[PDB]
Amino acid sequence: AIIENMSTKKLCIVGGILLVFQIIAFLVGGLIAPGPTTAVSYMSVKCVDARKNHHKTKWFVPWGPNHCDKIRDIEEAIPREIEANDIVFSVHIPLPHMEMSPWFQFMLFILQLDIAFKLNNQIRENAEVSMDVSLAYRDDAFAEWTEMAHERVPRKLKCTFTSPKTPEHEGRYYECDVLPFMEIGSVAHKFYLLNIRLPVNEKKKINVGIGEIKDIRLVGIHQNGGFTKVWFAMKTFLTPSIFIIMVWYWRRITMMSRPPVLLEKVIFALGISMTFINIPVEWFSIGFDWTWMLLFGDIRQGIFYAMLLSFWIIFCGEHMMDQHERNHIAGYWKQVGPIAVGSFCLFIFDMCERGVQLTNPFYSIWTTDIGTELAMAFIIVAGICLCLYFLFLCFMVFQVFRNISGKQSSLPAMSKVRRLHYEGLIFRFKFLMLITLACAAMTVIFFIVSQVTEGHWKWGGVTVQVNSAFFTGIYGMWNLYVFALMFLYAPSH
Amino acid sequence: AWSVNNFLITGPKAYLTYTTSVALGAQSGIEECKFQFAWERWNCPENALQLSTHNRLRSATRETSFIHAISSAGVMYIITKNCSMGDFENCGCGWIWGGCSDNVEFGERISKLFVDSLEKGKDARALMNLHNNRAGRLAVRATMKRTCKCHGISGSCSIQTCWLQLAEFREMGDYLKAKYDQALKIEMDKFLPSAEAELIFLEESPDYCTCNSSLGIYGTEGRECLQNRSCGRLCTECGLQVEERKTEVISSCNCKFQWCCTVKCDQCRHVVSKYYCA
Numbered sequence A: 001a002i003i004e005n006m007s008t009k010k011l012c013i014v015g016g017i018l019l020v021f022q023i024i025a026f027l028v029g030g031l032i033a034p035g036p037t038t039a040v041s042y043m044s045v046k047c048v049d050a051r052k053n054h055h056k057t058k059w060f061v062p063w064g065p066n067h068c069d070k071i072r073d074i075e076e077a078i079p080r081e082i083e084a085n086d087i088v089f090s091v092h093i094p095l096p097h098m099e100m101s102p103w104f105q106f107m108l109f110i111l112q113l114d115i116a117f118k119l120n121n122q123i124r125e126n127a128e129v130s131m132d133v134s135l136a137y138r139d140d141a142f143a144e145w146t147e148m149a150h151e152r153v154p155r156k157l158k159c160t161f162t163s164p165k166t167p168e169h170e171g172r173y174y175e176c177d178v179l180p181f182m183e184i185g186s187v188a189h190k191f192y193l194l195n196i197r198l199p200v201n202e203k204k205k206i207n208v209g210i211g212e213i214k215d216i217r218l219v220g221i222h223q224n225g226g227f228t229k230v231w232f233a234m235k236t237f238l239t240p241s242i243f244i245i246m247v248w249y250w251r252r253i254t255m256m257s258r259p260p261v262l263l264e265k266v267i268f269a270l271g272i273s274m275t276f277i278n279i280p281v282e283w284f285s286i287g288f289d290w291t292w293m294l295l296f297g298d299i300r301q302g303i304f305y306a307m308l309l310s311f312w313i314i315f316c317g318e319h320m321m322d323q324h325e326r327n328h329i330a331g332y333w334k335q336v337g338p339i340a341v342g343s344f345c346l347f348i349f350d351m352c353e354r355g356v357q358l359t360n361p362f363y364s365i366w367t368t369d370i371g372t373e374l375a376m377a378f379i380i381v382a383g384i385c386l387c388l389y390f391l392f393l394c395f396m397v398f399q400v401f402r403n404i405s406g407k408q409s410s411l412p413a414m415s416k417v418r419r420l421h422y423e424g425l426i427f428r429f430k431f432l433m434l435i436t437l438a439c440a441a442m443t444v445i446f447f448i449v450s451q452v453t454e455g456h457w458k459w460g461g462v463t464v465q466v467n468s469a470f471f472t473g474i475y476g477m478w479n480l481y482v483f484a485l486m487f488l489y490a491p492s493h
Numbered sequence B: 001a002w003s004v005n006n007f008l009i010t011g012p013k014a015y016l017t018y019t020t021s022v023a024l025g026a027q028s029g030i031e032e033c034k035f036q037f038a039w040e041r042w043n044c045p046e047n048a049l050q051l052s053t054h055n056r057l058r059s060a061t062r063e064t065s066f067i068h069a070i071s072s073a074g075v076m077y078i079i080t081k082n083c084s085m086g087d088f089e090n091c092g093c094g095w096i097w098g099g100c101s102d103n104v105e106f107g108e109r110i111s112k113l114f115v116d117s118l119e120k121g122k123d124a125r126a127l128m129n130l131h132n133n134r135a136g137r138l139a140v141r142a143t144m145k146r147t148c149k150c151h152g153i154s155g156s157c158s159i160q161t162c163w164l165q166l167a168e169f170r171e172m173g174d175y176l177k178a179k180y181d182q183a184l185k186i187e188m189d190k191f192l193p194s195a196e197a198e199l200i201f202l203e204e205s206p207d208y209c210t211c212n213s214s215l216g217i218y219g220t221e222g223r224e225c226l227q228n229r230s231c232g233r234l235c236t237e238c239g240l241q242v243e244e245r246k247t248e249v250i251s252s253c254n255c256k257f258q259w260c261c262t263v264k265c266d267q268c269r270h271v272v273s274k275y276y277c278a
């Protein structure tokens, strides 16, 4: 193959070119693209429904020309005699005179309830909040709204009060966990109206003992619209390079007398998966609204992760210089065992979590008593599979190192024809293993750095966004990894 | 000083619809300052807000440092809620490319320009107020709570979005009261600098328990407190009277509750041990 024939100078040159490309991949994210996500906090406007529901929606608007009759703060409903079901928390998702665009491509909403601590009125042991949520969309101002979804959204209140329960600390807010609210897969329309209602009933326990809610907040998360454009440019630049190199790789393979060996087919499949990821399908989300885009982009990268693990284990297995011939995938209980089962479990998990969110944007698998059990069982099985795969990989690495050590005591006593074959096999295995370890170390190190850091540095006169720099650099690093795999391990002249 | 008329005449241009909210937020800080000092010899009286401008040498006390910080903090808090509630058109903004400043830099800047313009001079007292106002704004940023959400691969933590959320105003009042307990007296000019997050005063407080009409002191006479604890030492030391009234007080009692609202209650009679110091 090409990796065998090339001298040290050509290998160093191609490594340097890849290094330059990876530096560019870091720099594009660091110095061009803004932060990956934008979290904007909203305060719900407590409108007053001073009528009886006549089967016609009102779409209480918080601010603007037709703004709802609102109470600025609770305890204003006591002088005005306002019931519990007559308060409609309304949030206009585009903060005044702004507008959402299809360059955000996802819309995460989560609720942050403000509950005051009162000695008489406290949160029950198992408090569930039931919300009569109605969501609407609108492209042009001075136009009607249209209902996207309207269903009851039940959430469990996991609130705690660290402060002592003495009357000296009454009126303090509960320290409560954030409730997952909604995630729609595409920013279809410019404006969104969200009305949240909290009906109460004493005969059947709905919104009973949920505490003393003062305000409910809401955080809107989207992909910043500028990180999206840079990501799209990167994907558009990466798809033709990978596609051409894969076509060239398979064209060279289907030019020799021998049929392809297992390792070359696995490399071809890994290139296929990388190509599948970097096809810029999401450009079509700018003109068309498809809520299934997150599912597609999740399945693509899950497939690539599974194929990468399979490639690692098969590369380790094939490079042992044993008496057995280890082509013919049938016999790899090490690959299809944990990897396939874990991938299937994660696929079921994402179909039951992000797949159901398509029809019901407010669905969360964690709210159901048995749904969370089934989900956590799926992640438990996936984690067990991942641990088993890591154990098998470590065992295979130890075995291949032991085999290399055993052979290397008898390389000099060979016919200097197959001896060069074994020396080259050992060198190629060590070289790719060190590259894989270095790539994984960089991935983990920069991931930890991004997770622990705020996101942007100021070493110079310009902010350096390391959060998006991570994503661009990892994308480029693994694309270049697949590129080097398909270029080094290709048939040569 | 912190009045709507003063914020209008002595206020920045190009931000004219905010002056009603700026003065309103300054009042929110004052009523918090009154709460934090309800059991002390100085109950954050509203007199030391407009009469505390002149006579800067005798008004550069530890208490006026808390006045400026809590008022500047209140303006930042009230404007941030206004922007989050949509009460102002553009708060922070590109929107398409990179988003905005999380509607708290706008609240900080609106607070900064409106309250820093009040101090016309640049003398020793003026430097103090600019320092104390900045310390109050920093206390708002320091008290902020950080919460994060994992929305990665299949809802994993491959990508995490983290945002800052304002704490309730009571938390910052406690934070600034703590900074008031540890305050630095400066020597003749605000020689060496001082920490950005620390309150600074210039002249020591007077004997507040003794009544002085000229110095705007109402004395520690005819005031409620608690014995169970802070008073007594603030009443027996200065003031030869305790005079436990033991007068009945009517309050809410045996109520049925919902998450909010006007509710069904009754009247409940019980005597209490209220005190009037001195």
Ligand SMILES: *[C@@H]1O[C@H](CO)[C@@H](O[C@@H]2O[C@H](CO)[C@@H](O[C@@H]3O[C@H](CO[C@H]4O[C@H](CO)[C@@H](O)[C@H](O)[C@@H]4O)[C@@H](O)[C@H](O[C@H]4O[C@H](CO)[C@@H](O)[C@H](O[C@H]5O[C@H](CO)[C@@H](O)[C@H](O)[C@@H]5O)[C@@H]4O)[C@@H]3O)[C@H](O)[C@H]2NC(C)=O)[C@H](O)[C@H]1NC(C)=O
Residues within 6 Å of the ligand: A072, A073, A079, A080, B021, B024, B078, B081, B082, B087, B088
């Ligand atoms: C930013 O966010 C801030 C809070 O987060 C907002 O602050 C709120 O601003 C409003 C607007 O002024 C204030 O709330 C009321 O303000 C009234 C102002 O007086 C006005 O009165 C008439 C209009 O109603 C009119 O003549 C004028 O326009 C005049 O300016 C106050 O009168 C009102 O007083 C309240 O308290 C009184 C004493 O407890 C009580 O008697 C009053 O009762 C009246 O109202 C109730 C309810 O409508 C009736 O049932 C009664 O019969 C009676 O008519 C009243 O309850 C109140 O202070 C206030 O400054 C502030 N509110 C809060 C809760 O903090 C900012 O406005 C926001 N910024 C922007 C730009 O929007």
Ligand SMILES: CCCCCC/C=C/CCCCCCCC(=O)O[C@H](COC(=O)CCCCCCC/C=C\CCCCCCCC)COP(=O)(O)OC[C@H](O)CO
Residues within 6 Å of the ligand: A004, A005, A006, A007, A008, A011, A012, A014, A015, A016, A018, A019, A022, A427, A430, A431, A434, A435, A438, A439, A442, A477, A480, A481, A484
């Ligand atoms: C920011 C960094 C991103 C990650 C960096 C990845 C780089 C990792 C470096 C790993 C070094 C692996 C070499 C291990 C030592 C080794 O294998 O033997 C050494 C080989 O020494 C070398 O010249 C190896 C040169 C390797 C150059 C870097 C490799 C880059 C190639 C592909 C990278 C894959 C994508 C990774 C991300 C791309 C951007 C960096 C000695 O061999 P030998 O003389 O005994 O035998 C000669 C042989 O027959 C030649 O024909």
Ligand SMILES: CCCCCC/C=C\CCCCCCCC(=O)O[C@H](COC(=O)CCCCCCC/C=C/CCCCCCCC)COP(=O)(O)OC[C@H](O)CO
Residues within 6 Å of the ligand: A277, A297, A298, A300, A301, A304, A312, A393, A432, A433, A436, A437, A440, A443, A444, A447, A448, A471, A474, A475, A478, A479, B158, B159
């Ligand atoms: C505390 C321990 C930390 C654990 C670290 C976990 C590892 C990685 C965490 C982050 C995963 C990857 C970051 C996500 C980037 C990514 O997926 O990009 C994907 C591309 O997918 C990739 O190529 C990422 C490949 C990551 C490979 C990780 C492998 C790390 C290996 C770890 C184990 C090491 C075993 C070593 C074996 C050695 C054998 C010789 C494209 O995104 P998209 O276009 O679909 O849109 C989504 C985008 O985010 C916005 O829309």
Ligand SMILES: CCCCCC/C=C\CCCCCCCC(=O)O[C@H](COC(=O)CCCCCCC/C=C\CCCCCCCC)COP(=O)(O)OC[C@H](O)CO
Residues within 6 Å of the ligand: A301, A302, A303, A305, A306, A309, A338, A339, A340, A341, A342, A343, A346, A366, A376, A379, A380, A382, A383, A384, A385, A386, A387, A389, B148, B149, B150, B151, B153, B154, B155, B156, B157
């Ligand atoms: C080395 C393996 C480590 C694990 C050891 C295995 C032992 C036990 C496993 C159980 C521990 C797992 C903890 C997960 C808990 C969990 O469910 O977290 C959930 C969300 O976590 C998840 O959804 C994890 C899903 C899987 C994470 C990795 C994403 C998919 C990875 C690769 C894509 C497919 C590759 C397939 C490879 C197959 C190899 C076998 C939320 O809990 P929360 O409500 O408390 O927090 C809210 C949060 O803000 C929501 O974002």
Ligand SMILES: CC(C)CCC[C@@H](C)[C@H]1CC[C@H]2[C@@H]3CC=C4C[C@@H](OC(=O)CCC(=O)O)CC[C@]4(C)[C@H]3CC[C@]12C
Residues within 6 Å of the ligand: A246, A247, A248, A250, A251, A254, A255, A272, A275, A276, A279
């Ligand atoms: C990106 C996701 C949606 C899947 C995309 C599938 C293609 C990227 C793959 C699947 C079928 C592949 C092809 C299968 C057939 C071959 C023929 C091969 O050309 C030859 O065999 C020449 C024979 C000779 O030596 O004379 C070159 C690669 C190619 C086009 C493959 C290229 C890439 C292809 C199109």
Ligand SMILES: *[C@@H]1O[C@H](CO)[C@@H](O[C@@H]2O[C@H](CO)[C@@H](O)[C@H](O)[C@H]2NC(C)=O)[C@H](O)[C@H]1NC(C)=O
Residues within 6 Å of the ligand: B211, B212, B213, B214, B215
């Ligand atoms: C109120 O405060 C003023 C000034 O702090 C007091 O006036 C001083 O009183 C002392 C009494 O020992 C004199 O030595 C000073 O000369 C006075 N200074 C001035 C400028 O008059 C005053 O006594 C206090 N009490 C009252 C009731 O005014």
Ligand SMILES: *C(=O)CCCCCCCCCCCCCCC
Residues within 6 Å of the ligand: A298, A299, A301, A302, A303, A306, A307, A310, A335, A336, A339, A340, A343, A344, A346, A347, A349, A350, B153, B154, B155
């Ligand atoms: C969160 O749920 C991540 C997405 C789940 C991954 C999707 C499943 C894809 C299946 C992988 C197929 C390739 C397996 C290769 C082994 C032979």
